Design a binder for these strands. Sequence first.
RNA 1: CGCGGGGUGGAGCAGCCUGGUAGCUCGUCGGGCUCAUAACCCGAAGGUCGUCGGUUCAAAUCCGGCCCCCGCAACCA
RNA 2: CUUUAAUGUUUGAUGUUCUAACGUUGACCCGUAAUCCGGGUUGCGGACAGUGUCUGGUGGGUAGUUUGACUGGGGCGGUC
RNA 3: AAUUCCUUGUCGGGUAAGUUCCGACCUGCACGAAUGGCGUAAUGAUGGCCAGGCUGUCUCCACCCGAGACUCAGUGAAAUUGAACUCGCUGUGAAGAUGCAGUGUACCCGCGGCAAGACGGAAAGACCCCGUGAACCUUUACUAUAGCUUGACACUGAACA
RNA 4: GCUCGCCGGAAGACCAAGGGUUCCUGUCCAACGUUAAUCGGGGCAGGGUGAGUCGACCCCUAAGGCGAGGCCGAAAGGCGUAGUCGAUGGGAAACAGGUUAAUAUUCCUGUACUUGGUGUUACUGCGAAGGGGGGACGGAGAAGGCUAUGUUGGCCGGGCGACGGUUGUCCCGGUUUAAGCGUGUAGGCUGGUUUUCCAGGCAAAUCCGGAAAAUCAAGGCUGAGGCGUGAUGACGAGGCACUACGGUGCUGAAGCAACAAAUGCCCUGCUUCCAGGAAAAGCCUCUAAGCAUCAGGUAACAUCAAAUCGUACCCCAAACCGACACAGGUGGUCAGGUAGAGAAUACCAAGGCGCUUGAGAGAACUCGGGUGAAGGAACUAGGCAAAAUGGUGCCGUAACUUCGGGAGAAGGCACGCUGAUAUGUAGGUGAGGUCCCUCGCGGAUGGAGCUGAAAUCAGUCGAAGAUACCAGCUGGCUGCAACUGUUUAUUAAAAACACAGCACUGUGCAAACACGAAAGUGGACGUAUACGGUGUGACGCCUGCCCGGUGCCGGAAGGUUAAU
RNA 5: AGGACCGAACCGACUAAUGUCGAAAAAUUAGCGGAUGACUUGUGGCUGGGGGUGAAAGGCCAAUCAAACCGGGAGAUAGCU
RNA 6: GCUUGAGUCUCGUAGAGGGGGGUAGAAUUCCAGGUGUAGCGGUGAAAUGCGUAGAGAUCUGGAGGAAUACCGGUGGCGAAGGCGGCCCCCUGGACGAAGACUGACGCUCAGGUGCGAAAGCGUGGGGAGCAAACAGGAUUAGAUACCCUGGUAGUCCACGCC
Lengths: 46, 271
Amino acid sequence: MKRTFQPSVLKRNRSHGFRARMATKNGRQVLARRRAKGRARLTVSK
Amino acid sequence: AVVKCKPTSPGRRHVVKVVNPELHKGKPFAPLLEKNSKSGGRNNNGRITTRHIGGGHKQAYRIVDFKRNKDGIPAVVERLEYDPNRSANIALVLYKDGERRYILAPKGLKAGDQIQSGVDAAIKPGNTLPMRNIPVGSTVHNVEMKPGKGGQLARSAGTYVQIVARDGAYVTLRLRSGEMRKVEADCRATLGEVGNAEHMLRVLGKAGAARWRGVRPTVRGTAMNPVDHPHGGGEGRNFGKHPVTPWGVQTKGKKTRSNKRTDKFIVRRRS
RNA sequence: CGCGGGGUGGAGCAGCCUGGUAGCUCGUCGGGCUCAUAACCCGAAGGUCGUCGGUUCAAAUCCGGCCCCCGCAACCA
RNA sequence: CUUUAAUGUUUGAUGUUCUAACGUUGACCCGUAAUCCGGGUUGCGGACAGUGUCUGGUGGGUAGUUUGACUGGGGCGGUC
RNA sequence: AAUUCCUUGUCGGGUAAGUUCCGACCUGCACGAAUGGCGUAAUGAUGGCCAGGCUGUCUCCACCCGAGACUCAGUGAAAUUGAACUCGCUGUGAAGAUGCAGUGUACCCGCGGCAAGACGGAAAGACCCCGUGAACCUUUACUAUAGCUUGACACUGAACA
RNA sequence: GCUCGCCGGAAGACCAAGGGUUCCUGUCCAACGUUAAUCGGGGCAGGGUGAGUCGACCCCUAAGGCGAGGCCGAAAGGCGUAGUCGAUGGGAAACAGGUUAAUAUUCCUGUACUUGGUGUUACUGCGAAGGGGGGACGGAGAAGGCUAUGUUGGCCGGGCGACGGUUGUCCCGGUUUAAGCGUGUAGGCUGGUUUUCCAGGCAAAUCCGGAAAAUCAAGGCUGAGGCGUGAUGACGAGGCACUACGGUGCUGAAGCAACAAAUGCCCUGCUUCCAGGAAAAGCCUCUAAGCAUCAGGUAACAUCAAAUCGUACCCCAAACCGACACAGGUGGUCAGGUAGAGAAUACCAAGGCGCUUGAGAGAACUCGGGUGAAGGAACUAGGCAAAAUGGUGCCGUAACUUCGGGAGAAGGCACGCUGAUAUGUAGGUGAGGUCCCUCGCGGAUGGAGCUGAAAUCAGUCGAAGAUACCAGCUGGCUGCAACUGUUUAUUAAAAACACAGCACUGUGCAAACACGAAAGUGGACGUAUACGGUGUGACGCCUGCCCGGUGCCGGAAGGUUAAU
RNA sequence: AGGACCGAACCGACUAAUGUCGAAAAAUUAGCGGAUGACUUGUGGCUGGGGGUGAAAGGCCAAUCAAACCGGGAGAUAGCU
RNA sequence: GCUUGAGUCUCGUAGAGGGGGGUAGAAUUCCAGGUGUAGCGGUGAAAUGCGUAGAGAUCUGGAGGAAUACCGGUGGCGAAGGCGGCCCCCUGGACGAAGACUGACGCUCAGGUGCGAAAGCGUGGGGAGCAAACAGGAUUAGAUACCCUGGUAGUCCACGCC
Ligand SMILES: *C(=O)[C@H](CCSC)NC=O
C-alpha cells in the first residue's frame, strides 16, 4: 500500500500559500473568512 | 525497399521495415532545428480535445522552407535526411551562395543534385516555378494556396497534384482525393512528386509500435457503457443503435461540408 | 382467462375496405395436334359465398351468437 | 369578361460585372529586439461569408418528470 | 457446441463402472458469414477430461519438534446486557416455551473442554411488496433546449442583361 | 565484562524529502513504555549546529504559471505578447590527518584552487537586448586499457603456545596515503595552413558558411590511469607511562612486488539500429549605434572581498506517512571473504542488535513443520494442499508448422577426493637482459615469476559426490482468445479490453472534430501514402441473399408549408 | 535484433492456509507473473463535480462514487417508524 | 594432321523479336452549358430500365482508361507460348556475299535450370468500354439457361507466385 499524505512542503505552500490564496478572487474571500472567525493559523506554513 | 524482418519472436513475424540506405548516417544540421514538445492533444483549458494522443518519443522540429522565396539562386542537394515529423524525408539543400536549407524531396532526387527556385528554372524534378510557366498537364507538389502562405498541398510521401489547365486567371488542379479546385496562377508549385513512395507499404507489426510513435489506444463504443458513449451497455454487446460519433453526430454517411466561403473554389467534389 | 385476422368450386386465392355486376391459374369431362404420354391450345359444367336471424328497393357485402385455425400463456424466490 | 400587346409605373426572383462595407489564420513595413495586436501600402475574395433578431425542421447530445388501482404475495391474465 | 429446451439425445473409443470428456450422425425449441464463419503453429498464474511420476489427500491415522492454549506473578480490554432464586419432558399458547399447568428429576459453588438452545451477538434485511419517495440509464413516453440547419429583416451598395 | 546466537545487497554505513531538538550531559520515577525500571526518544535543567570551495539563495532556461498594453466576455473573469517566475536540468573552485560528552569536504595544522573590485607597469583599439561555434544530449551491444578493491608472497613486530604434534613449506597483526601541479600515454576525433572574392547569416564583419587557387603532409583538440612531486610529512601494529580506573601524554618498524578484477572511469566514446533522440546562459569571438590625450581588453604582480539561510539527530524507521514505540510502504549512493555464473543463497568481516513481559507445565485442540509400515487419488465440486522433479557439459528428441520454432520436448551418461600426464597443462599476464631509435609513458625480442580451466588414466572412501542452502513436474486430446500486455486498489485478472492488420465514412486547410457563451487553442507549426469517427480483431481460405422498415446521401418538378 | 527465454533488486497480485474485535480499517507465510519493455520510478506541473480520467470496470477523482467533500438554501419533505 | 562438321571476324538485308520512356487519332462513357421535345432504348414480340426534375438526338469545350480501322497477306520474326499506330534508347536471333582463320572444338541428354497464353492468387494504383457471380424483366410444364437491360471481381500497370 501507500498512505495518502506524502509530506512535501513545496506543494504544501504552492496551492495553500498565503501568496497563493491572496492571488485570485475566491482565495481572498477565504482569507477574509478565516480572519472573520478569528482563527490564529490562517493557512499553515513555516 | 520492402525489407521484411524474419519471424524470430511473436510480433516480429509481421514487421515490414522499409528502411533507407540513402540518408545521412548522423545527426542533422543543428542550426535548422527547434524544440517540439507535444501537448498530447490538450487545449489551453487543459481538457483532452482530441483522443488517442499521449506518450511518444521526443522530437526536434526542423524548420523546412516551402515558400522558396529566392529567385535566380542555384542550389545543390548535398544530402537526404530522415524526418520525425513528415512521411516525406526532407533534403538538406545548399544554395551556391552559402546558405543551407531543408525542403521536401521529389522522386528520383539524389545527393549532389542541382536545382533552382524561380520562374527562370526549366523542367526537372525538384525545381519550383510560379505555375503559369509550367507544362500544362504536368505533375507537381507543395502547392501554396495563398501565394505567400508557404506551401499547402501534397506534402506527404508519394503524393502529387496534376495541373489540369490554366483558364483565365485560375489554375484547375486535381488532388489525389479527386477534389478538383480552382486556385489563382499566382501560387508556387514545385515540380515532380514527393519521394519515399514506399511509405504506405510500411506496416508496424507490433502493438507497441503505434504507441512509441505517440498514438494512444482507441476504446471502441460497443465496449464503453451507455454513460460514457452513445452506444454501449447490453449483456452480450447488445449493439443495435445507429453508428454515431461519441457526441451524437451521425457517422458513416453524413456530409459535414459546411464552409460556404470556399465553395467558389471547389469545382468537382470528391468522386 | 384475452386480443388481432380469416373461413369463398376438387387445391388455393379475387372481390369485402367505400352495398344493385361473382374472376383467375391448376384440376375434372372431352376433343384436337403427336405412332404414345406429358405439355400445350380451346369450350363447357362446377360457388347454399360456414350457418341462422335482423335490416333496406337488393345481403357475398353492414351487424350479432356458435364452431374451426395461427402467434403469445403454461411464472419468478 | 377573356385572350394579348407597346408604354408609363410599382416591387420581386435570377445572370454577370464593378468597389468603397466587410472578411483576409496572403506578402511586407512601422510601432518593436516582440509567432499577440493595431494601423498603413498592396494583393485576393466580395455585398457573399459571418453575427444579432424573428422563424420552420431536426434533435436523449442535455434537462425536468410521468409511467393507475384492486389483486387471497408480486407478476402475467382479467375487470373498473 | 461457452449455442441443443426436451435429454444422462444416438453410435463408437477410454474405465469393471463415464450425467463430464473425445470423434462423428443432423431431429439446429433458438449457429452463421466484420454485433464475422471455419481452421490455426506459437503463447497462456485460462476452462474440462486422461495417463505416468510422486506423495498422508484417503483406506485409518500414529509419533515427534516448536509457537499459543494450562498454572503462577505484574498490566488489563472487548462486542453484549430490562430484571433473574436461569432443569428436562407432555400439552396449551401471537401457532417450536428456562419462566403457565401437569410432572419427573435435581446437594451449593468453580475450572478445563465441546458448540444443541437462549428463534444467540454484529448489519433500523441487500431478498419480495408497499410509498401517488429518490436516483441514474434507454427510446418511435410527454414537453422544452444546446448545437446544427432553412429562409426573411438588418450591417448591405451601385450598374446593365 | 565473559560466552551463545541473528542480519550481513542488512535488521550495516551516509544523504534528499519530511519531521522539529526526538542529538549529548546531569538528575528524577507518579503520569508515557501494553511487565518492573536507579533505563530511555518520558518530566525538569544546561550545552551543541562554526564554511569563498557542500546544498540553496544567485546566472540561465524546459513542462507550465503570472502577465502592462492587446483580443474577448453580463460582472466576476478567460487566454495570451513583450517580459518575468519556475528544477528533477545546465553553470566557477578542496582533499587528507588530528580533536569533542554532542559538530566538522566548515574547527586546527599541512598542502592547493576559483570568480570579481581598486591600484602598479608594459602593450594593444574596444564596444550590444544583434550574428556564429560550443554548451548539446537516443536505445541497445561487443571490445581494449586502468582503478577502487581482494589475495598470496616478501619484509617488519610478536609467539612457538594450558590434551598429542608445532623453530618450521608454522601461526597471528600491519603492509595505509588524497586534492592540486608537472608529464601529458593507451584511445578517439579531424586533413592543417596561406591568398582572393561573395545576390548569405533583418545591417555590418576579419567570426561562420561557400567557390576556386597554394604548399606540405601533419598540426591541433581531447584524454581515465601510471609515473614524479605532494611527503627527510601525516598516519601507523606493538611498546613506553599515569588511572578520576572512562581514557590521556609520548615514541614509533615495514610501508613494496605480483596476479586477479568491477555495473566505476577513458565513454557527455566506437559499431549498429530505428521509434530519429531539450532549451537558454556561462565561455570563445566578430562587428552595429559609436567612443579613441580617453574609456576598456590582454599579461604579470600586490592587496582586499567572497555576503545570507541550512549544517544538531532520525533518514527502507519506536523520530516520515499509517490515531499506537504497528510483521506495511519510502527515491539515491558506498557495498568485503569463501563456494557459486550471480546484487541468488548459506556461512562470516566492518558494524549493529537479541525484536520492552517472563518463570514453570508439555493436557485436548489450533497453528508452523519433520517422519512413516502396505497401497497410491480409492480423497473430492476438482490432484486444492503437501510431496516429487530441480545443476553443468554432452548424447539424443516426435505430431505439427507461419519453417522462428515445437525444445531445456521426453528419455539418459559422467560428477567427491588424491596423484600422475605436467616438482599444477592449454590459455592469460609478464620483469631483467639484448637490439634499434624520428629518445619517449617507445617498438620488437626475450622468458623468470605469478595466476589458473579442463580432458584422460589409476587408486580409494561412503548407502549417497549438482551429497546442504539454491534449484522446472512431464506428456496426450481439445474449447476460447492470436501473442507481450491491461482490468473491477479493498471478494471476479478471464473467454473481458487493448492489439498490429483490415473496412466504411467524414475532411481541400480559418479542414472535419473537440474544449470554450467569446477570444484563443488542440488537431498540426501535420495537410489525402495526412488527421478524426465507427465496426471487427494476427495469419490462411472466404466473407452469400434482402433497400420493404429505420437512418444517411443524391434529385428535386409538384402538393403541404413559418416569419415577412 | 528481439513488446526473446531462465531468473534477483524492482513492480504487480493467481492459489491455499493463518488472520477477520488481526501485527495490519486487504497484510504476512510458502510457491507464482513480468523483468530492455506497451517497463518501472523520484522530483514537479496541467485536466475538477453533471465535470475530470479511463488499454473502458459505470472502475478511479485523499480509506468516501450510476455522479466527491465542505458551507448555504434548510428546522427541506415524509399519507412513514 | 587435314577438311567437306561446327564456330568466328570484315560489309550489308528484312522484320508485330524483347524491354523501357513519351506521343497520336477516331470511337465509347461521363461532367457542364446552349438549342429543342414526347418518346429513347430493345426484341421474334414485349417488358424491366431511361424520360415532362426535361432524356435520346445535336453542337462546343474538357477529363479520362483501354485497344490500335485501312495497310494485312495459307504474309513476317521467334524455341514454343506468343507478338502488329508512330518515334527514341538499350539489345537478341536468323540470312546473304567474296575470302580468311581455329582445326572434330561435335549430336542428344535421365537429374538439373530457365522461359512459359488465359484464368486465378498477394501488395499498391488505375477503372472507359466489356463483363463471371448476382438482380430484374421475358421465354418456359419449371429456367437459378439461350435474349435484353444494369452490374462487382477481373480485364490494364509496376514487383512476385502459380
Ligand atoms: C431468493 O432465494 C433470494 C435471492 C437473492 S439474490 C440477491 N435469496 C434470499 O433472499
